[PDB]
Design an enzyme around this catalytic site. Structure first.
Site, mmCIF file in Angstrom:
data_model
loop_
_atom_site.group_PDB
_atom_site.id
_atom_site.type_symbol
_atom_site.label_atom_id
_atom_site.label_comp_id
_atom_site.label_asym_id
_atom_site.label_seq_id
_atom_site.Cartn_x
_atom_site.Cartn_y
_atom_site.Cartn_z
ATOM 1 N N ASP A 176 4.913 2.751 -4.015
ATOM 2 C CA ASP A 176 3.704 1.992 -3.711
ATOM 3 C C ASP A 176 3.049 2.491 -2.426
ATOM 4 O O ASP A 176 3.515 2.157 -1.324
ATOM 5 C CB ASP A 176 4.051 0.507 -3.593
ATOM 6 C CG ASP A 176 2.842 -0.365 -3.267
ATOM 7 O OD1 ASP A 176 1.712 0.118 -3.425
ATOM 8 O OD2 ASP A 176 3.037 -1.545 -2.871
ATOM 9 N N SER A 183 -14.966 7.571 -0.430
ATOM 10 C CA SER A 183 -15.514 8.323 -1.546
ATOM 11 C C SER A 183 -16.999 8.554 -1.337
ATOM 12 O O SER A 183 -17.677 7.731 -0.747
ATOM 13 C CB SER A 183 -15.270 7.578 -2.863
ATOM 14 O OG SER A 183 -16.009 8.166 -3.924
#
Length: 330
Positions: A35, A199
């Site tokens: 994770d 992004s």
């Protein structure tokens, strides 16, 4: 040193991925959920409330000659999806894919929430975010990656998740045969303890690319792709009959649809998520309403590039002094 382990979807929807991990001496092998959005290595154990164990493999520290109780240490964690666990702490030898750390904090669960109990395939989590998020008290502990780092050939690990198929976690090296073209690297902020990056925009299907900054985290422990409501609305508007259902808890679409791809930007590069990756199947057995793999982050408080996005790429988690993230197509 290096390590290399295969990671495998737990079910037919790729809801999560498990990776075998050796703990203790002699080895006890548990299948953990790697994770990159948390920083605790915790396991089902011999100390876990018996009614809260349902099929998991447990760590038994009394059977490990290298296990030592970390006196006074406790842990307690809550995750974004509302699940939780807590317990006490051992140090022991932990190996992943041939890579060995001695003195690793292994957090032993006394209590887990129903979500973990109900998932018989996940024996625990292995956190790969930054050690600043580790919940051990009163002495915070380091992640497996932080402990391994100085010994690694290169201070990196990579995630190569499969679509309905096995993939790979590598530590200490970049497998140049595992991706196509070039790796594009992008800046990381560790201010929140996550692999947080920006992004450069998105496209829906064969649509034009929209340049726009989207701050989010690379999180292997989250199934879906959670993005701003504007983005998610633009995506599902291209699917006939798609709608946001409050009763179901997100965007659903007719199971007869063909889903468009979704492209996200990494600097000047582009990662394309095929439409099939965004199909998470009937909302209930036999239903003709299907659950979408792109959902709104509104009310989460952060955008999450979860497995839906990450499995479309070869992803480098670079833990150099100045960390960065790299993305390649594959």
């Amino acid at each position: 040193s290096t390590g290399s382990a295969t990671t495998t979807p737990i079910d037919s929807l790729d809801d999560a991925y498990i990776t075998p991990v050796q703990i203790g001496t002699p080895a006890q092998t548990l299948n953990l959920d790697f994770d990159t959005g948390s920083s605790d290595l915790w396991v089902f154990s011999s100390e876990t409330t018996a009614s809260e164990v349902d099929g998991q493999t447990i760590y038994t520290p009394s059977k490990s000659t290298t296990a030592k109780l970390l006196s006074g240490a406790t842990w307690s964690i809550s995750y974004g999806d509302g699940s939780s666990s807590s317990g006490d702490v051992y140090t022991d030898t932990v190996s992943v894919g041939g890579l060995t750390v001695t003195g690793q904090a292994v957090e032993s669960a006394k209590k887990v929430s129903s979500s973990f109990t109900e998932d018989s395939t996940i024996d625990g989590l292995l956190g790969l975010a930054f050690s600043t998020l580790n919940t051990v008290s009163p002495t915070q502990q380091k992640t497996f990656f932080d402990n391994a780092k100085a010994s690694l050939d290169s201070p990196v690990f990579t995630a190569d998740l499969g679509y309905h198929a096995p993939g790979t976690y590598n530590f200490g090296f970049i497998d140049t045969t595992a991706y196509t073209g070039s790796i594009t690297y992008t800046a990381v902020s560790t201010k929140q303890g996550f692999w947080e990056w920006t992004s450069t925009g998105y496209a829906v299907g064969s649509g034009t690319f929209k340049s726009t900054s989207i701050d989010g985290i690379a999180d292997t422990g989250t199934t879906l792709l959670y993005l701003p409501a504007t983005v998610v609305s633009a995506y599902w508007a291209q699917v006939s009959g798609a709608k946001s259902s409050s009763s179901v808890g997100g965007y659903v679409f007719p199971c007869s649809a063909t889903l468009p791809s979704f492209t996200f930007g990494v600097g000047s590069a582009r990662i394309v998520i095929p439409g099939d990756y965004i199909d998470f199947g009937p909302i209930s057995t036999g239903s003709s309403s299907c659950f979408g793999g792109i959902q709104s982050s509104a009310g989460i408080g952060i955008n999450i590039f979860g497995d839906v996005a990450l499995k479309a790429a070869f992803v480098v988690f670079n833990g150099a002094t100045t960390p960065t993230l790299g993305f390649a197509s594959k």
